[PDB]
């Protein structure tokens, strides 16, 4: 009973390409209780509504969270290219999702701010014809292929990272580049929700 959103509130939220995932089954949630803590700037859903997602019984609820500047709102859409959706974070297009962009108020203190916002501007693979570059796109509910060579904080806007690939990996080189955005007055964060439904197990229910 009772779904636990506490880890989200303790410490420094990771960068988008290192999003933290909390998985919930068999509990009772109060979603507007959690959103009462933040100033909510954007709230858009897919195959569900902000009203419906706060009041349905699911077989599973997945909550990704990460630091994210409001200024890059438009980059969340899989529409456009957008380094975010291509190389950093991509929600399931199969399951019902929601995306929320919120600011943490001053009176919220347990959430610490990082030095800046970081993201991956390029994740590509130099084919072994060392001329052709093939983008390495992030999959739904997965992390970027480049997460192993990019540090959790991008050092200096424009930094490059490369790894020589063994023939097991197909050979060639993995190439990534990182970009940075200055920290805001109050930290800004993004939350991605994915829900699942079935036949005999929808135990993630709102608390009454």
């Amino acid at each position, epitope marked *: 009973v009772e779904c636990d959103f506490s880890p989200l509130l303790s410490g420094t939220p990771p960068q988008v390409y290192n999003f933290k995932r909390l998985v919930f089954t068999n509990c009772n949630y109060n979603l507007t209780k959690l959103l009462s803590l933040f100033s909510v700037n954007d709230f858009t859903c897919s195959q569900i509504s902000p009203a419906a997602i706060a009041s349905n019984c699911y077989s599973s609820l997945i909550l990704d969270y990460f630091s994210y500047p409001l200024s890059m709102k438009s980059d969340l859409s899989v529409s456009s290219a957008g380094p975010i959706s291509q190389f950093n974070y991509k929600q399931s297009f199969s399951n019902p999702t929601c995306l929320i962009l919120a600011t943490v108020p001053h009176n919220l203190t347990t959430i610490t701010k990082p030095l800046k916002y970081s993201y991956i501007n390029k994740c590509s693979r130099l084919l072994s014809d060392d001329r*052709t570059e093939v983008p390495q796109l992030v*999959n739904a509910n*997965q*992390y970027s292929p480049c997460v192993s060579i990019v540090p959790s904080t991008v050092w200096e806007d424009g930094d490059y990272y490369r790894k020589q690939l063994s*023939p*097991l*990996e*197909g*050979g060639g080189w993995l190439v990534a580049s990182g970009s940075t955005v200055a920290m805001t007055e109050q930290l800004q964060m993004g939350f991605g929700i994915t829900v699942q439904y079935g036949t005999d197990t929808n135990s993630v229910c709102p608390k009454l």
Partner: antibody
Amino acid sequence: GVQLVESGGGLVQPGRSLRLSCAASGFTFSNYAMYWVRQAPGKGLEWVALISYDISTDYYADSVKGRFTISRDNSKNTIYLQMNNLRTEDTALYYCAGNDYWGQGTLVTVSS
Amino acid sequence: SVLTQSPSASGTPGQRVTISCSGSSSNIGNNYVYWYQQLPGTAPKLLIYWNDQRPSGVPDRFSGSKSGTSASLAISGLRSEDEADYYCAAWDDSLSGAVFGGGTQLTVL
């Protein structure tokens, strides 16, 4: 879509030679390194040989080192496994399948 | 030099199973580990790429783990269609070759 079809399988006397062919489609052949894998009747998988995308570096398992020769034609999008000094242990289903996509193999039964 | 797999594994529908794949440093640790499924009478299909990545179509139920000397494949919510043989793969930079595991025949009761 990515399609892979193996060819050249049949009966081939031991110590004879047999060359296998692999027709690929649905992707840029020249851009992927390729594999050769075999499976003896009712047995587990065993790697054979490897060719880089371009024909450059090529590596082998000691079971086939010196006998088998891996090649390809990036202008014909075709893969070749030139097997020499074939043995009874070489009786297997030979699959040609750049990992992430896999085709139905081809039977290579000894001489007999 | 070799990849050691348990030959078999079992579980009930809905259960969770973990298939292990032990190796060395020249194979596992420095090179990624790969996971494949073979159903009766069919060609092998990619399950897990780059230690822990699922290609398009692979259900989230399948997950990979990687440590220094070993690797693992966790299967949650087991189903009868999962009854098959499971193989792990790694590279020998020294032998300059791919090496396969012995395979784990998973029977779903």
